[PDB]
Design a protein around this ligand. Structure first.
Ligand SMILES: NC(=O)c1ccc[n+]([C@@H]2O[C@H](COP(=O)([O-])OP(=O)(O)OC[C@H]3O[C@@H](n4cnc5c(N)ncnc54)[C@H](O)[C@@H]3O)[C@@H](O)[C@H]2O)c1
Ligand SMILES: CCOc1ccsc1C(=O)N1CCN(c2ccc([N+](=O)[O-])c(N3CCCC3)c2)CC1
Lengths: 492, 492, 492, 492
């Protein structure tokens, strides 16, 4: 494939009740291309008044007897597979939008992000008519069963690093279970989500089942979090804002909350691992998606015996990483999302140099149009450095050294975060020992960034609350109702 | 059985690391007999300082390599079985304590509460080695499985109306899953829980696995809810304080939260129901446990054609209900828990009179000592009235009337609470149409207050988050870890 | 829609390894149109030698590292999705084949049979990547999990009354689980199965994954049952042949056996039921698909109170039932499948008149071009008549009477069959007492012949071994492997 | 612990309906001590007449409304828990019985066998009230759920090699699901089964729930297998008799069959394994329980690099393995069960020598009384020798050499059996690949042989059908009934 020539941006308004609407305020906000600095377009900016209209539409779409509630579960599923067909048909357009808006290299957006988008929808198409309750051999003369009903109106808030993929991870399980959705994409990256609105009507979802409100966090986002007519909030973003979400939910509605927050994830390389493979996988674990991954392996612990050769190979690999235009096939790494993130990264890079960490390569911006940063590698990192403790969310790799398994297990878990972790070793006893010991929601053995819709994903400690994806992720999108019926005698 | 005659209150101290302790302040607080107002004893009052060393004890009990962590899961179950055996052995003393301290009729405490305590422990003893993760057929060369691990230190706060039963409902699933516990019982009712510390010790639970910290809400409770060393909090359950729990969770360390909150539950009697049976069930729905049940019971909708006869027989039965001393085997209704609850019920009765409800019987307290209230019946109650909107934790029955199944489904669901519902009818279509439409975590058909250990319990809307009991009660007490292993080839 | 007029039957060969083949012997057998007597075409006649080639094809396709074994589970589902796409496209052709070969009215074959096929494939397409093993909290220093793998070559033998739907019901769960399949359609109706072979090739299934061998029972069928290279057999047919299947499995290689066998299923009508509706449901419950249904409600028990009028409304309805050519929209009931079944009906019909039941209507053939039988109703049937103990499998409705609920449960259960049962009533206690006490694999309340891919289906007693359809159906097509790993220490 | 010095055999009668009966013929059969040949006692010999009486006791105990059908599921768990308490109490007596009757070293029977009996009952005691059906979201206006009823009367036949344990493996899941049981222990070892009858009566099981009929294969065993009043047969034993059981069940009443039929299980030692640990574990894998183990690692494959050292260490360990009296705490190996087994082992050893396998130690009987055989090791075994293909059930170790993982995968799997397998390696890729390619119901990695109550256990291919133990063991003891209710509207 190749990028869509002269990409037309035709969906820029708020999506409520399957209709495109203006701001109630009249205000719009700009969208920028992080590779060039230019302004792509203006998007209608949602605020509290627009959220209330979205919630009203989602609440009416969910009313008993409505088309969405009466629909056969198997038909919710076919609606989700139809959306997958449409995203497949419009694949190159959508990957061009994610590239133009998110700075993702186009071929990565096409073959990675968009593939996961289509697979997520097809996976949850299969689940809709396979959500089961139970019947229970209860004490006494009763017949007891549970029903797994949709919760109702689900408010969803997502960040900017995987716009289209996040969108699908949120709405696919929600819809599969029969909920209706008020979703606020990141203000940095609203474009693909809005295009998804057109596909969503084209697929034939009833009006109001999905409502897409682009806008800012403290306005549209905080309106969702505090709204009294929203039954559930799924939030993905930073840990500090996640604290605000949980506070707002208790203070307002006691709405149910899922949190997917930040990480500072350890990647543990043992000496007996394949050096070629572990170096490239730890390099991808840092630099994938411009380093803007919550799953970034940002604390690479290397066994003493190989640390020095590991540093040499990682440095060579980072020194060859092709930075440049996302539309160029050779580009490995695009720009950071915006200037605020760009500066956040460079000040962090300065912090590591000001502390005692050896800067092997990189360290500076590139000076080009946009927000490009040189692939950066620190060695001699110690656990006390800001670099080893704060989420960089940029193309900065940090290599630490360790001696014994007990040591590195302690140090990997010595963190307020616990999103993910990885171990590289051919030894089965320390593979399972380390993986069992990690306080993280996902552990990889001899791989990294293996995420899919089939597998539960979420954080330990302050990295989140609850789980997304897989059969477990469906639990957060239904309510359990126990029906107990008095019966004359009961046998079995 | 009969009450243990003199009853010594042997256990009045704080239970930390399997040792009895004085409060760090040296303060004690009194405990009263609700039927006479007399002071039963004084109990060591835990504050922030005792919470601190309880969490320290529980965290050490939870560290890798500890006796509790290394134990076979099946042997976790055995301890829960030994604990139930000890409760069954001392069943009379515990029933006397629940009666003396909580005002429950002793026979009710013996045959209902204490049976529900023994069965809770035996149910979850069996679950301990049957908590399964899964293996997932993901895309690509991967072996993906999930482990369910304990969350860690669980802080637990319970109310006063079912002291021993709620204590079991809280510690049993937590221990079944391998957690350690810091539990604060209600300041009114700490005696049953403290006796359990003695039986927890005699059963052989490792030190620090369970710590029992009597004290008050703004001190011991708020220290638990904000404690940055507690990984999960389970709360029961006024809805006002529930908001503060969830806010304090997001404000502190984003600990996982389960809430079991208030209720104002509808009971719908259709004309085609066994009238004699429905009158006695709806009467037990409001007056059971002195009306101090989250599952009342408190909005009885009766179809027009049987409304006069239903009211007539309800008033006949309330007037016959035997209020008196809990130790007396003829007593059906003991006192309310204390003066503040007594006053709240009497004020809500006044507001019912002051709004057009027909005070058919009752309305005032009984006698001069203790906190006895007459069984009170209101008919001609309408939705907008305060008594119909706010929960009266007291012996106060409110009878509304209805035509049409659709009307009463609207009126039943029109509520911020959704803990419980019941429908009485012999028609299968009515029973299933109404139970499916109810916005409540538990719907009983032709019965009321059927709360078995095998079946989950929890609220819709502002009545709580998450579920207790059943297999689903386990879900709140485990963290899910996904382990994804790269493999050479992969075949089905 | 209207049938494909003069339809060529293109596919008449044996389907092995995605190739069309002649029988080893060179023998062919005739296929007849049952509404007309005339010969439709000639089909290659498989025997033991062809079954051996097919098994060899299925075993090689199942070998480790083959395309079918290495395919992602999600891609198995996509293949099942494509098959449904194709069946939908050629829906008119396949319904026409089902009429012309099985004698079902084309309208009911287009809107019932072929909808069941498309929905079955689509359902099991979703299960493919959702078949999960478990991880087990086992005693000792061990890590234990289970894999759910395909069993291998599955032999499948199906009858003639729902040829295409039986075909889907068999291969869809088998392929969803990753097995390879040797299937033998009924000698009477191989044509839609053989057409499905061409769509299977077009859809993309690897060679050898599905092999279709038309032929007779004692030759092709017995070859499958005693083949030492087949790991599992799924047989649907008569009870007498089912005994031979289980016996042949035991004598050969102990292949796993699921049997779906005969039925003489009860249908209980209480007075407190909607006569209008219940009469039409009991009518369809025995006359649907020309009475050639294993689920046929062939023992209609009616409460004395309404026996009178039930017979009158049933007879009035049967005398109106339109018998005619399958391609005519007005036809409700086509012919029986062949002369053997035809003569079996009337012979059993004669026993009814000779044993003392009132022939209320029908009871004879039509103008003998095709095997048409006039709709027949026996009233005053007793429990010991041949008409009440033996499967008639034709348009014959037996109506008995009963007085007491306990009497009718005893009478309905007095049978060696137990495939299905139905109770019509509006009383919840009666509906639940009767359904719980029925010795039947499927109990319908206030409906009949409600069957989906989603629901487990099978016989109690001599009506079957094992279950098909739904999730429980998947268990039969999968083999459990427990893997236990020694670990250095367990933390639980 | 020490043996129960004299041990009178108290219980020698047929156990039906909780009463001890004489045989209908009056005949008794002798029970021998395998260490001395001396007769231990006489036991009533059950035959067809006795099975008939036992089936109607079990059938009446299973009737709707009986004590066993009406009892709370949880109460069945309590009874199973009581049986474990009683076995625990009489652990010394039962271990002495198992040792005296079965020849097991007393310490082995006390600490291994009896611990497994107790833990089996306590595991399934927990499952009784946790057997759930489901509620299914089907198309149309339906409420579909499933109930998991008991099947009915379950006949059960077990061998002599783990008499008490396999008794526990059979009845625990059957009773946990609520069936009634007619169980025939092996003619060699009926004593500990009969003593359990005393404990079953003492534990409070209703009469007829468990009936124990000691007797012989073709007489009492075959009458069980072909009985038309038995709904399910659970058989553990040889593949040859397993064929007859499955054949008998097809020819009689189509009862449900599960088969556990033993094997010829491969044990693969890679060069990168903990060598001394592997030598000891492969030794135990062969010589545990006098080699009379269906799990016996009878084909140990050793990588050529370490073959010579492995053989030498195996010869040393085998030559120092203490053979002697079961009651001596020094004894690791007791006698074989009887003269038939002794002779069959001695012949097979002769076959190995005649066919060129190198006999490194042992090969002859030991002494003049009892059935002791010298521990025996065969050096250079090849896959085509009779000893490499046939189950020996004796203290005979067979060591083969191999070069390549893919070679040893083929050779391990080239067999009609597939009960169990093991691999020893520290490489994670070798352990995963080999465990996934094994055609065996249980694969151990770096151990042998961990059989818990939590883990399913059964054979591939001709090693059996279905599974025992764990949660999957309960699936064979329940029928599934689908109930489908028509409902007016349905809202998803
Ligand atoms: N879980 C398992 O898979 C497992 C466990 C232990 C043993 N085994 C196998 O059992 C066999 C050892 O026992 P065995 O060969 O001495 O006993 P066996 O196969 O001859 O008989 C086993 C049981 O079946 C009874 N029996 C014998 N003939 C019968 C007949 N015609 N009809 C009905 N019942 C009959 C016997 O009385 C006995 O109780 C070994 O092959 C072993 O592999 C399998
Ligand atoms: C010595 C290992 O100890 C352990 C360790 C963890 S658990 C367990 C245990 O409890 N044991 C006792 C039953 N063990 C056994 C061995 C061989 C056979 N066998 O027949 O091949 C059988 N059985 C087959 C089905 C029932 C008995 C059982 C050995 C494992």
């Amino acid at each position: 494939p190749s990028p869509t020539p002269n990409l037309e941006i035709k969906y820029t308004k708020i999506f409520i009740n399957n209709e495109w609407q203006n701001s109630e305020s009249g205000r719009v906000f700009p969208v920028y291309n992080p590779a060039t600095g230019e302004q792509v377009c203006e998007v209608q900016e949602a605020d509290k008044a627009d959220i209330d209209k979205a919630v009203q539409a989602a609440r009416l779409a969910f009313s008993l007897g409505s088309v969405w509630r009466r629909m056969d579960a198997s038909e919710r599923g076919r609606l989700l597979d139809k959306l997958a067909d449409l995203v497949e048909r419009d694949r190159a357009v959508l990957a061009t939008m994610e590239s133009l808006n998110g700075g993702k290299p186009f071929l990565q957006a096409f073959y990675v992000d968009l593939q996961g988008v289509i697979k997520t929808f097809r996976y949850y198409a299969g689940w809709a008519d396979k959500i089961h309750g139970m019947t229970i051999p209860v004490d006494g003369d009763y017949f007891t069963f549970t029903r797994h009903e949709p919760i109702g109106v689900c408010g969803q808030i997502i960040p900017w690093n995987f716009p289209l993929l996040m969108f699908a991870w949120k709405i696919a399980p929600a819809l599969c279970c029969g909920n209706t959705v008020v979703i606020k994409p990141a203000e940095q990256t609203p474009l693909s989500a809005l295009y998804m609105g057109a596909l969503i009507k084209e697929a034939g979802f009833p009006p109001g089942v999905i409502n897409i409100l682009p806008g800012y966090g403290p306005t549209a986002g905080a309106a969702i979090a505090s709204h009294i007519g929203i039954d559930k909030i799924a939030f993905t973003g930073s840990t500090e804002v996640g604290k605000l979400i949980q506070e707002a939910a208790g203070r307002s509605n006691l709405k149910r909350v899922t949190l997917e927050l930040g990480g500072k994830s350890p990647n543990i390389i043992f000496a007996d691992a394949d050096l070629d493979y572990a170096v490239e996988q730890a390099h991808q674990g840092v630099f994938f998606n411009q380093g803007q991954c919550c799953t970034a392996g940002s604390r690479i612990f290397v066994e003493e015996s190989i640390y020095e050769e590991f540093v040499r190979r990682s440095v060579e690999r980072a020194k060859r990483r092709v930075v440049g235009s996302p539309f160029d096939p050779t580009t490995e790494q695009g720009p950071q999302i915006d200037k605020k993130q760009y500066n956040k990264i460079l000040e962090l890079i300065q912090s590591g140099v000001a502390e005692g960490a050896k800067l092997e390569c990189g360290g500076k911006g590139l000076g080009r149009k946009g927000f490009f940063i040189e692939p950066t590698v620190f060695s001699n990192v110690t656990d006390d450095m800001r670099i080893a403790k704060e989420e960089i969310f940029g193309p900065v790799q940090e290599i630490l050294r360790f001696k014994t398994m007990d040591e590195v297990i302690e140090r990997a878990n010595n963190s307020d975060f616990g999103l993910v972790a990885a171990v590289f070793t051919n030894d089965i006893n320390k593979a399972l020992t380390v993986s069992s010991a990690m306080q993280a929601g996902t552990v990889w053995i001899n791989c990294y960034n293996a995420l899919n819709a089939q597998s539960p994903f979420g954080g330990f400690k302050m990295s989140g609350n609850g789980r997304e994806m897989g059969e477990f992720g469906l639990r957060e999108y239904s309510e359990v109702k126990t029906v107990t019926v008095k019966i004359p005698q009961k046998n079995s």
